[PDB]
Amino acid sequence: AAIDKLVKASHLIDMNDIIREGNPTLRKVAEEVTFPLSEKEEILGEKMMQFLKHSQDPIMAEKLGLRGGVGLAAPQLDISKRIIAVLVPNVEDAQGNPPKEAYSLQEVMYNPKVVSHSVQDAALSDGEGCLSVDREVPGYVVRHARVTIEYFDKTGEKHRLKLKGYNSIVVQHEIDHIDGIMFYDRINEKNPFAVKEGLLILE
Ligand SMILES: [Zn+2]
Ligand SMILES: [Zn+2]
Ligand SMILES: [Zn+2]
Ligand SMILES: [Zn+2]
Ligand SMILES: [Zn+2]
Ligand SMILES: [Zn+2]
Ligand SMILES: [Zn+2]
Ligand SMILES: [Zn+2]
């Protein structure tokens, strides 16, 4: 099964492991994971984070042929489980100093959900890209500006977190995968760049 292939100790996730638009797995509602986690589910999360770290590293990305990512969802690996990884780096200053914190968000989340959110909407100015979609897709992907999420970590510990900005967008994008929703579902059908008043456009 897919999962067996992915959790092999020597196996590194690459783009040949990522399923693409058209595969039905991407449209299902993924199954909740139960605790305590199986070994496979723990390992899968670790491999998914490793994939993100590799995608962000100029060397490994080039070694393995990776498109950069800041989030990955298990359905994109053909695994219909509610497991996401997110890895959002902070940036250097103009002087080339590293940020105080490497990342603004770094988590492998089990059973994540949005529990509340702002009335306000937001969208990335640059639109969204998807590792599973090999097409140019223009437009504003209209999301909640701010969200409160719940999720469990690999140990079974429950977290409750509020997010805003880019990090809010990322998490939402990944939770959508485990509900079978694609980014372009949230692009206006008639004018991809329509702006309803009060939409927060994030640069
Ligand atoms: Zn592989
Ligand atoms: Zn482990
Ligand atoms: Zn590595
Ligand atoms: Zn709650
Ligand atoms: Zn609501
Ligand atoms: Zn995605
Ligand atoms: Zn929502
Ligand atoms: Zn459409």
Author numbering: 2 to 204
What does the paper say about this structure?
The ligand binding site is localized at the interface between the N and the C sub-domains, as evidenced by the structures of the complexes between SaPDF and synthetic tripeptides. Crystal-soaking experiments were conducted with formylated peptides (Fo-Met-Ala-Ser and Fo-Met-Ala-Arg) but led to deformylated molecules in the crystal structures as previously reported for other PDFs2627. This is due to the ability of the enzyme to deformylate formylated substrates in the crystal packing. Peptides, which therefore represent deformylation reaction products, were found bonded to SaPDF through a high number of non-covalent interactions, which are similar to those found previously with Escherichia coli PDF (EcPDF). Indeed, the free N-terminal amine group coordinated catalytic ion and was hydrogen bonded to the catalytic residue Glu175. The hydrophobic methionine side chain fitted into a deep hydrophobic S1’ pocket composed of several conserved residues (Val71, Leu125, Glu129, Tyr167, Val171, His174). Finally, peptides were in a conformation mimicking a β-strand which was hydrogen-bonded with the main backbone peptide bond of Gly130 from conserved motif II (E129GCLS133), Val71 from conserved motif I (G70VGLAAPQ77), and Gly69 which preceds motif I, linking the two β-sheets from N- and C-terminal sub-domains.
